[PDB]
Design a protein around this motif. Structure first.
Motif, PDB file in Angstrom:
ATOM      1  N   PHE G 138      -6.031 -21.047 -34.740  1.00  0.00           N
ATOM      2  CA  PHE G 138      -5.699 -21.517 -36.090  1.00  0.00           C
ATOM      3  C   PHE G 138      -5.984 -23.032 -36.098  1.00  0.00           C
ATOM      4  O   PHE G 138      -6.118 -23.617 -37.172  1.00  0.00           O
ATOM      5  CB  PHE G 138      -4.182 -21.317 -36.468  1.00  0.00           C
ATOM      6  CG  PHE G 138      -3.884 -19.833 -36.725  1.00  0.00           C
ATOM      7  CD1 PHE G 138      -3.668 -18.864 -35.743  1.00  0.00           C
ATOM      8  CD2 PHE G 138      -3.625 -19.464 -38.079  1.00  0.00           C
ATOM      9  CE1 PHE G 138      -3.344 -17.594 -36.049  1.00  0.00           C
ATOM     10  CE2 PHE G 138      -3.138 -18.179 -38.391  1.00  0.00           C
ATOM     11  CZ  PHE G 138      -3.119 -17.204 -37.388  1.00  0.00           C
ATOM     12  N   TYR G 139      -6.220 -23.637 -34.934  1.00  0.00           N
ATOM     13  CA  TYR G 139      -6.452 -25.086 -34.842  1.00  0.00           C
ATOM     14  C   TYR G 139      -7.896 -25.347 -34.534  1.00  0.00           C
ATOM     15  O   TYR G 139      -8.344 -26.456 -34.892  1.00  0.00           O
ATOM     16  CB  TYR G 139      -5.656 -25.767 -33.637  1.00  0.00           C
ATOM     17  CG  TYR G 139      -4.175 -25.915 -33.880  1.00  0.00           C
ATOM     18  CD1 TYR G 139      -3.386 -24.859 -33.510  1.00  0.00           C
ATOM     19  CD2 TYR G 139      -3.617 -27.144 -34.296  1.00  0.00           C
ATOM     20  CE1 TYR G 139      -1.981 -25.054 -33.448  1.00  0.00           C
ATOM     21  CE2 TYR G 139      -2.188 -27.312 -34.436  1.00  0.00           C
ATOM     22  CZ  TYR G 139      -1.375 -26.236 -34.013  1.00  0.00           C
ATOM     23  OH  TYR G 139       0.023 -26.341 -34.060  1.00  0.00           O
ATOM     24  N   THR G 140      -8.561 -24.364 -33.923  1.00  0.00           N
ATOM     25  CA  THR G 140      -9.830 -24.614 -33.359  1.00  0.00           C
ATOM     26  C   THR G 140     -10.958 -24.055 -34.135  1.00  0.00           C
ATOM     27  O   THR G 140     -12.034 -24.597 -34.043  1.00  0.00           O
ATOM     28  CB  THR G 140     -10.019 -24.090 -31.940  1.00  0.00           C
ATOM     29  OG1 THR G 140      -9.844 -22.678 -31.801  1.00  0.00           O
ATOM     30  CG2 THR G 140      -9.073 -24.910 -31.060  1.00  0.00           C
ATOM     31  N   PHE G 141     -10.798 -23.048 -34.984  1.00  0.00           N
ATOM     32  CA  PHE G 141     -11.886 -22.412 -35.602  1.00  0.00           C
ATOM     33  C   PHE G 141     -12.669 -23.363 -36.444  1.00  0.00           C
ATOM     34  O   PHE G 141     -13.873 -23.443 -36.418  1.00  0.00           O
ATOM     35  CB  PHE G 141     -11.455 -21.174 -36.464  1.00  0.00           C
ATOM     36  CG  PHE G 141     -11.076 -19.899 -35.708  1.00  0.00           C
ATOM     37  CD1 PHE G 141     -11.120 -19.901 -34.273  1.00  0.00           C
ATOM     38  CD2 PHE G 141     -10.795 -18.658 -36.434  1.00  0.00           C
ATOM     39  CE1 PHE G 141     -10.790 -18.697 -33.570  1.00  0.00           C
ATOM     40  CE2 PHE G 141     -10.429 -17.499 -35.698  1.00  0.00           C
ATOM     41  CZ  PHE G 141     -10.316 -17.610 -34.280  1.00  0.00           C
ATOM     42  N   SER G 142     -11.943 -24.318 -37.085  1.00  0.00           N
ATOM     43  CA  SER G 142     -12.456 -25.426 -37.815  1.00  0.00           C
ATOM     44  C   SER G 142     -13.138 -26.506 -36.925  1.00  0.00           C
ATOM     45  O   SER G 142     -14.202 -26.962 -37.361  1.00  0.00           O
ATOM     46  CB  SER G 142     -11.343 -26.219 -38.550  1.00  0.00           C
ATOM     47  OG  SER G 142     -10.236 -26.455 -37.676  1.00  0.00           O
ATOM     48  N   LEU G 143     -12.551 -26.932 -35.794  1.00  0.00           N
ATOM     49  CA  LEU G 143     -13.032 -28.066 -34.896  1.00  0.00           C
ATOM     50  C   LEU G 143     -14.278 -27.609 -34.303  1.00  0.00           C
ATOM     51  O   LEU G 143     -15.210 -28.383 -34.140  1.00  0.00           O
ATOM     52  CB  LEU G 143     -11.952 -28.235 -33.810  1.00  0.00           C
ATOM     53  CG  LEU G 143     -12.292 -29.214 -32.655  1.00  0.00           C
ATOM     54  CD1 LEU G 143     -12.294 -30.677 -33.103  1.00  0.00           C
ATOM     55  CD2 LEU G 143     -11.348 -28.910 -31.500  1.00  0.00           C
ATOM     56  N   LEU G 144     -14.360 -26.268 -33.936  1.00  0.00           N
ATOM     57  CA  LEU G 144     -15.538 -25.720 -33.377  1.00  0.00           C
ATOM     58  C   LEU G 144     -16.698 -25.622 -34.331  1.00  0.00           C
ATOM     59  O   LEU G 144     -17.856 -25.884 -33.965  1.00  0.00           O
ATOM     60  CB  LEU G 144     -15.283 -24.296 -32.799  1.00  0.00           C
ATOM     61  CG  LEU G 144     -14.445 -24.308 -31.573  1.00  0.00           C
ATOM     62  CD1 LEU G 144     -14.191 -22.833 -31.201  1.00  0.00           C
ATOM     63  CD2 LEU G 144     -14.813 -25.178 -30.353  1.00  0.00           C
ATOM     64  N   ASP G 145     -16.453 -25.356 -35.637  1.00  0.00           N
ATOM     65  CA  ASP G 145     -17.511 -25.230 -36.569  1.00  0.00           C
ATOM     66  C   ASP G 145     -18.158 -26.582 -36.782  1.00  0.00           C
ATOM     67  O   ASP G 145     -19.353 -26.625 -37.004  1.00  0.00           O
ATOM     68  CB  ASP G 145     -16.986 -24.788 -37.908  1.00  0.00           C
ATOM     69  CG  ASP G 145     -18.142 -24.587 -38.857  1.00  0.00           C
ATOM     70  OD1 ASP G 145     -18.852 -23.574 -38.672  1.00  0.00           O
ATOM     71  OD2 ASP G 145     -18.368 -25.434 -39.766  1.00  0.00           O
ATOM     72  N   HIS G 146     -17.367 -27.639 -36.694  1.00  0.00           N
ATOM     73  CA  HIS G 146     -17.961 -28.935 -36.936  1.00  0.00           C
ATOM     74  C   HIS G 146     -18.918 -29.411 -35.939  1.00  0.00           C
ATOM     75  O   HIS G 146     -19.980 -29.863 -36.300  1.00  0.00           O
ATOM     76  CB  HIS G 146     -16.684 -29.897 -37.125  1.00  0.00           C
ATOM     77  CG  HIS G 146     -17.050 -31.222 -37.756  1.00  0.00           C
ATOM     78  ND1 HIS G 146     -18.085 -32.052 -37.345  1.00  0.00           N
ATOM     79  CD2 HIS G 146     -16.512 -31.872 -38.845  1.00  0.00           C
ATOM     80  CE1 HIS G 146     -18.127 -33.154 -38.139  1.00  0.00           C
ATOM     81  NE2 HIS G 146     -17.256 -33.032 -39.094  1.00  0.00           N
ATOM     82  N   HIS G 147     -18.429 -29.333 -34.681  1.00  0.00           N
ATOM     83  CA  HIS G 147     -19.107 -29.972 -33.596  1.00  0.00           C
ATOM     84  C   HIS G 147     -20.164 -29.053 -33.028  1.00  0.00           C
ATOM     85  O   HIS G 147     -21.089 -29.582 -32.449  1.00  0.00           O
ATOM     86  CB  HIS G 147     -18.115 -30.347 -32.501  1.00  0.00           C
ATOM     87  CG  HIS G 147     -17.288 -31.486 -32.966  1.00  0.00           C
ATOM     88  ND1 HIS G 147     -17.835 -32.743 -33.394  1.00  0.00           N
ATOM     89  CD2 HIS G 147     -15.936 -31.603 -33.131  1.00  0.00           C
ATOM     90  CE1 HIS G 147     -16.803 -33.508 -33.713  1.00  0.00           C
ATOM     91  NE2 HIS G 147     -15.574 -32.851 -33.612  1.00  0.00           N
ATOM     92  N   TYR G 148     -20.075 -27.691 -33.267  1.00  0.00           N
ATOM     93  CA  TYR G 148     -20.995 -26.768 -32.674  1.00  0.00           C
ATOM     94  C   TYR G 148     -22.152 -26.564 -33.605  1.00  0.00           C
ATOM     95  O   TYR G 148     -21.967 -26.529 -34.777  1.00  0.00           O
ATOM     96  CB  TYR G 148     -20.379 -25.395 -32.380  1.00  0.00           C
ATOM     97  CG  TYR G 148     -21.290 -24.423 -31.767  1.00  0.00           C
ATOM     98  CD1 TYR G 148     -21.539 -24.429 -30.398  1.00  0.00           C
ATOM     99  CD2 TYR G 148     -21.848 -23.412 -32.509  1.00  0.00           C
ATOM    100  CE1 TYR G 148     -22.338 -23.487 -29.720  1.00  0.00           C
ATOM    101  CE2 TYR G 148     -22.603 -22.410 -31.868  1.00  0.00           C
ATOM    102  CZ  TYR G 148     -22.889 -22.452 -30.457  1.00  0.00           C
ATOM    103  OH  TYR G 148     -23.721 -21.490 -29.909  1.00  0.00           O
ATOM    104  N   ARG G 149     -23.404 -26.401 -33.038  1.00  0.00           N
ATOM    105  CA  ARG G 149     -24.610 -26.119 -33.633  1.00  0.00           C
ATOM    106  C   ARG G 149     -25.344 -25.212 -32.697  1.00  0.00           C
ATOM    107  O   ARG G 149     -25.080 -25.363 -31.499  1.00  0.00           O
ATOM    108  CB  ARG G 149     -25.559 -27.254 -33.977  1.00  0.00           C
ATOM    109  CG  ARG G 149     -25.031 -28.036 -35.130  1.00  0.00           C
ATOM    110  CD  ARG G 149     -24.165 -29.259 -34.737  1.00  0.00           C
ATOM    111  NE  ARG G 149     -23.771 -29.988 -35.901  1.00  0.00           N
ATOM    112  CZ  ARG G 149     -23.049 -31.163 -35.888  1.00  0.00           C
ATOM    113  NH1 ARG G 149     -22.686 -31.840 -34.759  1.00  0.00           N
ATOM    114  NH2 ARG G 149     -22.582 -31.735 -37.037  1.00  0.00           N
TER     115      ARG G 149
END
Lengths: 226, 212, 229, 222, 196, 204, 195, 195, 196
Positions: G138-149
């Motif tokens: 619930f904390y990471t799904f967002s942080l991962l979408d940003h930084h991951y490509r």
């Protein structure tokens, strides 16, 4: 939910409205109550739609089997027993409530069955939320030896009353006039009270009003032979 | 709901959504979750909407009376504590409040007191209250520094809501950006989150989990 | 919190061209046991109003007594009054409603369903409903409980709308009420053979016809059936 | 155990244009599938071109209005007949519902009128207490049934200009008074079929600077 | 729904109120209750119409098969078969069945099977909800080996009280007189009996 | 309350002329947590399309089952299942488990092979045939679409006038509902060609 | 708590599993594996109920082993994942439920691509670049979408992983006594022991 | 959070108090120390339910301050701790209880004596060599029973404290995020250099 | 528990049993429940003994004050004061009180106050456990302006049947005869009327 049955000399008439609702949301403006057990024994279902459907199929296969074995169309009294003994088994968990009406050689017959397997006999009955409202029309104008004409008009009248005071009662009334030894005359949508007025202002929109991400083309046809 | 606040050198950035759901459906996407208690303070509707509204309309009065009497600007501390007392005492009245009182004095500097329906009053550098707080925190923490530039903080505030808005069901609406400067809060426009999503998508190459 | 103990039953009523008609059978049932078979549930106040009270008998007398006082209160101060500020069905009505909702707010209502019928000082016909939760409406035809479902539909066949009011004569209206009450006796158990009838007509005042009987019982269908045998 | 709060169905609709505001509603009054009253109005004039319906539990709404009438009398008496503002009424109403918060009132209330600017304006109240300025807001259990139509016929939300396919959004267009009345009729007519709360009559009180107009149309009874 | 059966000289006369009620609503007022499970053993039904029917239909099959293979069923013997089903279905079903019969040998005989199930032979019996009112009446006016004409009169009267104080009781008092003559149905409307 | 309300999500089907549309949102969330922006809900076994709402495990287990039963059919009968036959089968199978019921709302859609008619039908939890030609609407926002479509409804539309209507209805309803959002996919079946369309929407 | 977090990079799957096993108030042991290898390129990490997971994870391991020998072909992640989903539809309707949530990160060695399945306890299978369980996602799904490509190498993923784990210990009162990292790739299963 | 510790040594009273503030499942703050200075020689740390924590702690502070100033005489630490016990003995019988566990350390300046009072939630006050509250306290009661000696200097008191800290972090799944340790002694109240 | 009052020509006769049971145990078989609230207004108590006993004392003192200041209470007046306390406290207090009293101008008056609490004048009144049993027997046998001796007999006839049907009814039939004569006690043993 308003269903009535009324006897006459030449048969029995059973009618119902076809406004069906699932919650206060009108699910369907036409959804026939009226099920077929056999071509001269028709019944209407009250209670849950799923409950009436499942059951009507089960007994209608059973009667069919019996009808062939004995090479004579069974009695309406066979069908009452059959409903009753099944429902008793589930101890009324399955709550199906029907007016069962039919004609047969024995004569013309009118029965009730309920969830727990309670029955009622009588020349005239009515069932569902608006039963109270229909019974009211029926006690004032009933007469010994109603004629076909009188009983049909009275049955549809009782429904019209139901429409007004009971709001799961609306829309078109389907009527099955079942006459002894002669093909049942389905007077589908005998009374329709409805009116539909189209949209005053057209709501059609030109094309490509709506935004699209990407399009694709797919097939369901079998792959090519070559 | 997602609402967040961060203090830094330049003051405080407060950013809120606008969605408010009743039952499973979107009731509204225009409830502004910024309550201007007065020109100096921003309070949030987060938590119980009605309770928050009613009791900060109340809080406006207490600030005003103080300002009149001593003729100087109220500390953020004094106002949040006054709120805290009122809400503890009445609890068990279907109160559900959760608010960040945001203000920038020189008496104390940038100051945030989170007030709660229980009666808890908690200071922090960074608070995030919401259903979608949880999403917001990931992006917020990693670009959070005190010595973060002002310019970068403005972007950060929009991005933090963009993120929450996207994942959380109970959040969408629009972005209201506010900066709590020395002299009071300043409004920095309304910006639709719906639209921002596409610009950002194109611009960084982000939003790749997302089809296409 | 008041909960039903002693019980009452349906009240039927309608508007017509020169007044109104209210009728109710005379029962004070204690549940299945029909303990009291003649407790008159229609309580006239003057000729102006007849207030039909269903539900608990206990609260019927509580309100009955409030009305008795209310007559005296009205007569105090400017007693040459007789049609001015003197009581109207609406005066009466408003009082009951306000008390009733305050009783509901203390989560302890007077447990009744009530129809005020009567004729205003203007001559206009008044029919307005109020009940224990505090549902307020006026309608050309009004009935409660069992009456709502059964004796209301027949009333509507006649007074379908506003325009039908003038067409309905006091004579048709009289046939209509009387016929309807027989039906309710047939198919409800609560309903007794004895009933009372009250007509508030602007021209003839109050005509209060007591102790009429329901006859022409149907057993013509009873004898046809013998069921399984 | 007595029923704590009734329901009496009904749907209302307050729409803020740019020179008029309507408050619409059906006349159908219900408890369960019985029609309690076929004809019984619900939009009430409160004066100074502010209309009010507190829709849902009818008894709570009668109380709410009843007190507000009295307040209109004392607002004018002390303030030398200052025209009772729309906003002023709103703050007042919030404060009646917050009055018992422990067992909150069960009414979904809408007041419509003109703001002082002079645009049509609608303010909407959720029972919990809170209120806010709104553009178009239907109330009641069929609030959710009606709203999507308005957000695709006037708001033009999620409509874009033909042939852009999304580049350029289709901008707001102000509608005449008439145009809105038709729209209100059609929404309600559709709901007569699809919901048992709406029917009997559609009584609309329209509030302008030019005074109060009353508009009536029959709806079916099936 | 009050029901009774009362012995007289020539046998037994069963009478019964005919209504079937759903709540305070009278669901049906011409319903059949004096139900033939055998030639001169007939039964009065109270409780849930559904439950009792189930019992009665099973027994009706038993008594026909009893008669052909094991000769004539006694009233006592028949009450036994009813008693077994009642007893096992004491919680599951609530069924109160007055099984009553006329043997030419033993004249009128009454067995009452209560909800818990038991064969209790009694001179005369009253059941249903109205039984109470006329408990005291009936005891005082108990004559032995009554004249036939009187017996008819007596039942009419007892049930007449029942109907005034309880709304469920009501409709036609149907009767079946079981004597050496055969099975005679009688029907009596409230016009005839209510006044008296 | 019901487990079908915890994951939300909607299916809607409409009729045209000799053409059908059937569309859904691609959002599957479990309350707050949006899980997928691409979880399909409309599936096809040939030309009879099967849209399924509710409880997520239940969707998958039943899609596999109904796969199972129509696979038996195609070999036995030696011919493609019909829209009609399929309807009757679906209902019966939901009543099989009356107790421990299925917590789904399937929608059958198709164009009859022999009759050429566009057909749609709906089912309750324990399954019943619900005929209503204009639309069958489902899911938590079922009321929203009931009213919305009926005001916009104009009969037997051409493929292109139909596309616009279902798009407009899905789009506003979704944004007025919490649990429906993220992407959309629409199957416009012209007669037996399928053009398959992802719609653009302002994702929040 | 007891996190299982996964992210799928360009050419492998990276699964994190907590060392800590908590049998209530007391951490009953603070270093102990939480994952078992089903096949040489398929790995299944587990968290859910106490001791139910222990039993379930071992029975699930054997079934797959058996099959694998039979066909002399290790079951693909696809096959592996659906097998498990099947078992869970039975389990959730069971007289006594067996509520175990899983991540199966496997190397689809018949297409030469990593594949990550998220399967929750009810049983729903979805292929995704990332999925998680607990309060991890619930904390990471967002942080991962940003930084991951999509272009991100594995090595990069590991540096990001540290940061992701770091926030979690901070904003949740729980502490996981870090994670052991297992990399499932074309080579098979390799240990990452830096973490 | 659930831990507050105290140890009364030779020549001082040492208090260690949690920094974590966890309001549900999220750590809203990881730093704020849950203590209120009652006198320069008396420190109260506190723990319990949301809302009750802040109201109570500050209400007590006010009362001791008022007392202190009225007579210009610093009340004995013995008196202060009795004060609190009574206010609580009232609370528990009242409409609304205040459920707060407190360790009251005071260095009696005059009798040059360290004194630590453990008042658990009930309003059971006892004076002990050493104490704690909550479930947390159980773990550490052994290290204190064994290694404590009266002759432990202030400095040796710090050392034992670190070892207790370490054990608490190991077997509690919830980390209390370290402690701010302050010394109440004849110098007054000072914060330990490190912690 | 069975209590009654029946009007006749010359006044009213109050009757009661006297057997009060706690569970199956007979706690007291000779319980008095004809309680004087006024010289010729007495009351009959059923329900909870505790509660009716408290009620009756409060009313009693009230009617004394009414006699002294405002002049003699009539039977109606008493019925109201009983009603008002019963009504407001319908729920907390269980009360089945028959207020009967005798005016020479209006002969015997009988007013029953049920649990709900309302005033209803009746020619005769029945309450308690045993009233259900005799409900119809009394209607059949009711006779208006009958002889004083027939009134004695009737009470006796009806109550014997109550004892048969109800085993908590029984013990001495006590009576308070209110006629203008005064107040007269009659006491009739079980031994007499049970065999009669």
């Amino acid at each position: 939910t308003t269903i009535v049955g009324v006897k006459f000399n030449n048969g029995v008439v059973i009618a119902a409205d076809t406004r069906s609702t699932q919650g206060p949301i009108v699910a369907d403006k036409n959804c026939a109550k009226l099920h077929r057990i056999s071509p001269k024994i028709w019944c209407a279902g009250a209670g849950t739609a799923a409950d009436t459907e499942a059951v009507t199929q089960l007994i209608g296969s059973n009667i069919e089997l019996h009808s062939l074995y004995t090479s004579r169309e069974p009695r309406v009294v066979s069908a009452l027993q059959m409903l009753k003994q099944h429902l008793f088994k589930y101890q009324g968990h399955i709550g199906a409530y029907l007016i069962v009406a039919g004609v047969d050689p024995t004569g013309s017959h009118l029965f009730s069955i309920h969830a727990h397997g309670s029955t009622d006999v009588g020349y005239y009955l009515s069932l569902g939320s608006g039963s109270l409202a229909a019974m009211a029309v029926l006690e004032s104008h009933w007469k010994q030896d109603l004629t076909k004409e009188e009983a049909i008009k009275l049955a549809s009248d009782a429904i019209q009353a139901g429409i007004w005071n009971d709001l799961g009662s609306g829309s078109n009334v389907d009527v099955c006039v079942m006459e002894i030894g002669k093909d049942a005359e389905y007077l589908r949508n005998y009374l329709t009270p409805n009116v539909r007025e189209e949209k005053q202002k057209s709501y059609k929109f030109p094309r490509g009003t709506t935004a699209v991400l990407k399009e694709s083309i797919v097939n369901i046809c079998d792959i090519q032979e070559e | 709901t997602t609402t967040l606040a961060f203090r830094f050198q330049g003051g405080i950035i407060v950013a809120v959504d606008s969605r408010a759901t009743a039952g499973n459906w979107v009731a509204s996407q225009t409830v502004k979750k910024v309550i201007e208690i007065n020109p100096f303070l921003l309070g949030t509707m987060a938590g119980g909407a009605a309770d928050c509204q009613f009791w900060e309309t109340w809080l406006g009065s207490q600030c005003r009376l103080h300002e009149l009497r001593e003729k100087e600007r109220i500390s953020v501390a004094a106002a949040s504590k006054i709120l805290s007392n009122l809400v503890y005492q009445y609890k068990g009245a279907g109160l559900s409040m959760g608010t960040m009182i945001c203000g920038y004095t020189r008496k104390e500097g940038p100051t945030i007191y989170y007030v709660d329906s229980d009666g808890t009053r908690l200071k922090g550098d960074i608070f995030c209250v919401g259903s979608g707080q949880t999403f917001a925190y990931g992006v917020l923490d990693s670009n959070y520094k005190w010595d973060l530039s002002v310019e970068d903080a403005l972007y950060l505030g929009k991005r933090s809501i963009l993120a929450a808005a996207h994942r959380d069901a109970y959040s969408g609406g629009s972005v209201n950006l506010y900066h709590v400067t020395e002299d009071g809060w300043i409004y920095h426009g309304n910006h639709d989150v719906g639209e921002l999503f596409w610009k950002v998508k194109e611009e960084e190459g982000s939003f790749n989990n997302v089809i296409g | 919190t008041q909960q039903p103990i002693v019980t009452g039953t349906s009240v039927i009523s309608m508007k017509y061209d020169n007044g109104v008609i209210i009728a109710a059978d005379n029962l004070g049932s204690y549940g299945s046991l029909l303990r009291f078979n003649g407790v008159e549930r229609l309580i006239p106040v003057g000729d102006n109003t007849v207030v039909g009270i269903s539900g608990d008998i206990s609260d019927m007398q509580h309100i009955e007594r409030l009305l008795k006082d209310l007559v005296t209160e009205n007569a105090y101060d400017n007693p040459l009054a007789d049609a001015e500020e003197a009581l109207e069905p609406s005066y009466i009505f408003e009082y009951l409603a306000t008390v009733m909702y305050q009783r509901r707010s203390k989560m302890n209502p007077l447990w009744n369903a009530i129809i005020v019928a009567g004729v205003q000082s203007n001559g206009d016909q008044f029919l307005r409903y109020v009940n224990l939760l505090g549902v307020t409406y006026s309608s050309p035809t009004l009935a409660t409980g069992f009456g709502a479902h059964m004796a209301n539909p027949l009333l509507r066949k006649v007074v379908d709308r506003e325009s039908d009011i003038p067409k309905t004569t006091v004579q048709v209206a009289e046939e209509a009420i009387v016929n309807a009450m027989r039906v309710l006796y047939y198919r409800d158990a609560r309903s007794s053979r004895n009933f009372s009838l009250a007509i508030i007509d602007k021209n003839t005042g109050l005509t209060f016809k007591k102790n009429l009987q329901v006859e022409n019982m149907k057993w013509d269908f009873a004898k046809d059936i013998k069921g399984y045998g | 155990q007595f029923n704590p709060y009734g329901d009496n169905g009904g749907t209302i609709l307050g729409i803020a244009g740019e020179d008029f505001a309507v408050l619409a509603g059906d006349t159908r009054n219900i408890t369960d599938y019985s029609i309690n009253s076929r004809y019984e109005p619900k939009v009430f004039d409160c004066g100074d071109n502010i209309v009010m319906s507190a829709n849902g539990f009818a008894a709570d709404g009668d109380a709410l209005v009843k007190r507000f009438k009295n307040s209109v009398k004392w607002y004018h008496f002390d303030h030398n007949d200052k025209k009772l503002s729309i906003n002023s009424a709103a703050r007042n109403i919030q404060h009646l519902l917050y009055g018992k918060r422990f067992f909150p009132y069960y009414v979904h209330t809408i007041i419509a009128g003109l703001d002082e600017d002079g645009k049509g304006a609608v303010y909407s109240f959720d029972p919990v207490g809170s209120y806010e300025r709104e553009q178009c807001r239907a109330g009641g259990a069929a609030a959710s049934l009606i709203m999507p139509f308005l957000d695709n016929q006037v708001n033009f939300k999620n409509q874009y200009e033909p042939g852009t396919n999304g580049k350029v959004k289709k901008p707001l267009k102000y509608l005449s008074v008439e145009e809105v009345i038709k729209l209100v009729r059609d929404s309600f007519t559709s709901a007569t079929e699809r919901h048992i709360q709406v029917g009997d009559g559609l009584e609309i009180l329209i509030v302008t600077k030019d005074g109060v107009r009353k508009e009536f149309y029959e709806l079916k009874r099936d | 729904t009050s029901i009774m059966a009362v012995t007289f000289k020539d046998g037994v006369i069963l009478g019964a109120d005919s209504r079937t009620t759903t709540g305070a609503y009278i669901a049906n007022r011409v319903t059949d209750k004096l139900t033939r499970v055998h030639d001169k053993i007939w039964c009065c039904r109270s409780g849930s119409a559904a439950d009792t029917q189930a019992i009665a239909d099973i027994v009706q099959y038993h008594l026909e098969l009893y008669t052909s293979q094991y000769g004539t069923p006694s009233t006592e013997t028949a009450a036994s078969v009813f008693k077994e089903l009642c007893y096992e279905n004491k919680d599951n079903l609530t069924a109160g069945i007055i099984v009553a019969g006329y043997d030419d040998k033993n004249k009128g005989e009454v067995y009452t099977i209560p909800l818990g199930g038991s064969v209790h032979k009694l001179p005369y019996a009253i059941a249903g909800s109205g039984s109470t009112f006329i408990y005291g009446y009936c005891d005082k006016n108990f004559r032995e080996n009554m004249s036939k004409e009187e017996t008819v009169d007596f039942i009419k009267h007892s049930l007449s009280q029942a109907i005034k104080w309880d709304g469920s009781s009501g409709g036609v008092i149907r009767m079946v007189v079981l004597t050496a003559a055969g099975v005679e149905r009688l029907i009596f409307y409230p016009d005839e009996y209510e006044q008296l | 309350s019901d487990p079908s309300s915890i994951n939300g999500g909607i299916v809607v089907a409409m009729t045209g002329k000799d053409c059908v549309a059937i569309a859904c949102d691609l959002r599957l969330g479990s309350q707050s947590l949006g899980v997928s922006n691409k979880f399909e809900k409309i599936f096809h076994y040939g030309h009879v399309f099967l849209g399924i709402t509710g409880l997520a495990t239940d969707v998958t287990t039943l899609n596999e089952m109904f796969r199972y039963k129509t696979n038996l059919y195609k070999l036995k009968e030696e011919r493609a299942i019909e829209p009609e036959t399929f309807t009757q089968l679906v209902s019966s199978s939901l009543y099989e488990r009356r107790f421990g019921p299925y917590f789904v709302g399937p929608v059958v859609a198709g164009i009859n092979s022999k009759s050429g008619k566009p057909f749609i039908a709906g089912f309750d939890l324990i399954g019943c045939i619900d005929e209503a030609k204009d639309f069958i609407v489902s899911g938590t926002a079922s009321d929203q679409l009931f009213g919305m479509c009926e005001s916009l409804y104009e009969p037997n539309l051409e493929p292109e006038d139909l596309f616009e209507t279902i798009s407009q209805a899905l789009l506003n309803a979704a944004d007025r509902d919490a649990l429906s959002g993220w992407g959309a996919v629409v199957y416009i079946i012209k007669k037996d060609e399928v053009v398959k369309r992802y719609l653009k929407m302002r994702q929040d | 708590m007891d996190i299982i977090l996964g992210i799928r990079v360009q050419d492998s799957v990276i699964l994190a599993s907590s060392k800590a096993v908590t049998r209530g108030i007391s951490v009953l042991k603070d270093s102990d594996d939480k994952t078992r290898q089903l096949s040489p390129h398929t790995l299944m990490s587990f968290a859910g109920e106490a001791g139910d997971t222990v039993q379930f994870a071992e029975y699930i391991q054997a079934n797959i082993q058996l099959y694998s020998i039979r066909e002399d072909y290790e079951l693909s992640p696809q096959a592996v994942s659906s097998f498990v989903r099947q078992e869970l539809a039975k389990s959730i309707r069971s007289r006594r439920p067996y509520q175990v949530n899983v991540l199966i990160g496997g190397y689809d060695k018949k297409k030469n691509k990593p594949e990550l399945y998220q399967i929750d306890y009810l049983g729903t299978k979805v292929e995704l670049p990332y999925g998680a369980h607990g309060y991890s996602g619930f904390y990471t799904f967002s942080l991962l979408d940003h930084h991951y490509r999509p272009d991100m190498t594995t090595e990069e993923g590991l540096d990001l992983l540290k940061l992701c784990v770091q926030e979690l210990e901070k904003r949740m009162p729980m502490d996981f006594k870090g994670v052991i990292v297992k990399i499932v790739d074309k080579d098979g299963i390799r240990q990452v022991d830096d973490f």
